[PDB]
Amino acid sequence: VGELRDLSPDDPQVQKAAQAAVASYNMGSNSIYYFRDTHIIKAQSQLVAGIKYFLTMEMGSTDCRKTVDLTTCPLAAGAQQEKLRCDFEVLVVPWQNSSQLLKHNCVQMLE
Amino acid sequence: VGELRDLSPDDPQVQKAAQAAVASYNMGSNSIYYFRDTHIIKAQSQLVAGIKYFLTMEMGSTDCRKTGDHVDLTTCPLAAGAQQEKLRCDFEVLVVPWQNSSQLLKHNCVQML
């Protein structure tokens, strides 16, 4: 992790990263219409390192609703509590306070 | 990009990453209830290097609708008039050369006039 070098909007790798950013946004979007890149204003790149963690973990539903301390929310009880087996992929860089969830894949289990 | 080493479910850094993962899923999830971690089965860690790109860019709505995917935005003309919408977005993209793909990490898009 170093400080970002400024780049040319026309840099071919910048353009590759732009196209990727658009594609993922459109997959994410809540618009029916696809979106397209017009102009690229500011482009910067940083060099980065981090650890990627690969978790397989079981999670249970608590009773608390979303509209925060999860320790104080006790799990649901019996057939009412739904359990999940999830494979997570988390990325931690030393600079960020945050860590990012990259891929997650969850599946329900039987009683 | 290196090999995953298996680690202890109780490793404090593993615990911090589980905590992070849960929070992220909870914001993402389509459940009404928050979820909580019970048991940690398998934990592995991999070392990673790549470049992060920080784009600020303007995007327009095209006429192509949604009803990976097989899209050439080159073939999709921007909208005219009623369907017009312009966005100014700050993206953060991560590219690792070992992997082929790139990942969008943070995006913040804002409508324009």
Residue numbers in the entry:
A (entry chain B): 10 to 76, 83 to 126
B (entry chain A): 10 to 76, 80 to 125
Authors' account:
Cystatins are inhibitors specifically controlling the activity of cysteine proteases. The cystatin superfamily shares a common fold that is characterized by a 5-stranded antiparallel β-sheet that is enwrapping a central α-helix. Because of its strict specificity for cleaving after asparagine residues, it is synonymously referred to as the asparaginyl-endopeptidase (AEP)2 (15, 16). This strict preference is exploited by the legumain-inhibitory cystatins C, E, and F, which use a conserved Asn39 residue, localized on a reactive center loop different from the papain-inhibitory site to specifically bind to the legumain active site. Cystatin E is the most potent physiologic legumain inhibitor, binding 100-fold more tightly as compared with cystatin C. Thereby, it is associated with a tumor suppressor function in prostate cancer, melanoma, and oral carcinoma cells.
From a structural perspective, the hCE dimer was assembled from two hCE monomer conformers that are connected via their L1 loops. Analysis with PDBePISA and PDBsum revealed that the hCE dimer interface is built up by 45 hydrogen bonds, 361 nonbonded contacts, and two charge-driven interactions. This results in a buried surface area of the dimer interface of 6710 Å2 and an interface area of ∼3354 Å2. Furthermore, the free energy of complex dissociation, ΔGdiss, of 55.4 kcal/m indicates that the dimer is thermodynamically stable. Remarkably, we discovered the assembly of two hCE dimers to a tetramer. Nevertheless, the overall assembly (nearly parallel β2-β3 strands) is similar between stefin B, cystatin C, and cystatin E and therefore suggests a conserved mechanism of oligomerization. The dimers interact via hydrophobic contacts involving residues of the former L1 loops. Despite this large structural rearrangement, the local conformations of the legumain RCL and LEL were virtually identical in monomeric and dimeric hCE structures. The crystal structure of dimeric hCE uncovered two symmetric and functional legumain-binding sites, either of which is accessible for legumain binding. Upon dimerization, the L1 loop, which is essential for binding to the papain S1′ site, was incorporated into the newly formed βII-βIII sheet. Thus, loop L1 is not available for binding anymore, and the papain-inhibitory site is destroyed by the dimer interface.
